[PDB]
Amino acid sequence: SHPPIPILELADHIERLKANDNLKFSQEYESIDPGQQFTWEHSNLEVNKPKNRYANVIAYDHSRVLLSAIEGIPGSDYVNANYIDGYRKQNAYIATQGSLPETFGDFWRMIWEQRSATVVMMTKLEERSRVKCDQYWPSRGTETHGLVQVTLLDTVELATYCVRTFALYKNGSSEKREVRQFQFTAWPDHGVPEHPTPFLAFLRRVKTCNPPDAGPMVVHCSAGVGRTGCFIVIDAMLERIKHEKTVDIYGHVTLMRAQRNYMVQTEDQYIFIHDALLEAVTC
């Protein structure tokens, strides 16, 4: 009852969903249901509760990213983070919350252990005088986070985003790992971008810099479900268009909801994903 949409029909499809003040859009969006039961026992452990930015945004057990256990430290395997599939890609992303002072250590250890090369930050640190994320990286020089030393190497500031490159070393190892962070800075304080154009450009830039041989790309916003979900669905759907000349946004969001609660958290985000993708096809 929700088939894929050929790219040449996308405009008409969206038109229909927009009709009568987004009537059909809102009907489609609210129908999304993975049809499964989940558990989130780890997220609810007394020791792990302070590790959640939002107590109501948890990590399903079956898809959660595990940290290796630290001997004698209960709860040491936990991070509020889940693997998310891409288009014909298994566990291609990690969707996670903006890290907390108490979890900066866990966040970098996850980066290290998961062999990730790329972090996508979908938010400013503060917007509308509210903290969306805490600064988990050094403004300059080197910073130690739990077991990992992180050194800022390079910063490129543009109008709509920044790119920071880091060097990581781990306590006990001699490896150097390189990580870049792409921070999109042009998402509005309220609602979704007026135009998809800057976001799409940001995404191309990210995709040209993620090595084909790395672990999952880390994507994060505040709770790791709204703007995170948008990044992930748009990226996957673009790869789908390249391969198949169809979109199935509905089917993919249903799939992502089986991996992490609330992925694509608002109807307006759902609509923006359609808008961004239509712009990309009419290009």
Domain that holds residue 17: 1-283
| CATH number assigned to the domain comprising residue 221 | 3.90.190.10
Six-digit token pair at 66? 């595990």
Instruction: Please state the separation of Cα 53 from the chain's center in Å.
Output: 15
Resolution of the solved structure (Å): 2.0
The approach used to solve this structure was X-ray
Instruction: Tell me how many domains the chain contains.
Output: 1
**What separation in angstroms does the CA of 113 have from each of 33, 63, 169, 171, 235?**
32, 16, 12, 13, 24
Instruction: Please state the separation of Cα 42 from the chain's center in Å.
Output: 21
Q: 119 with 165: CB under 8 angstroms?
A: no
- The CA distance from 35 to 32, in Å, is 9
Q: 80 with 58: CB under 8 angstroms?
A: yes
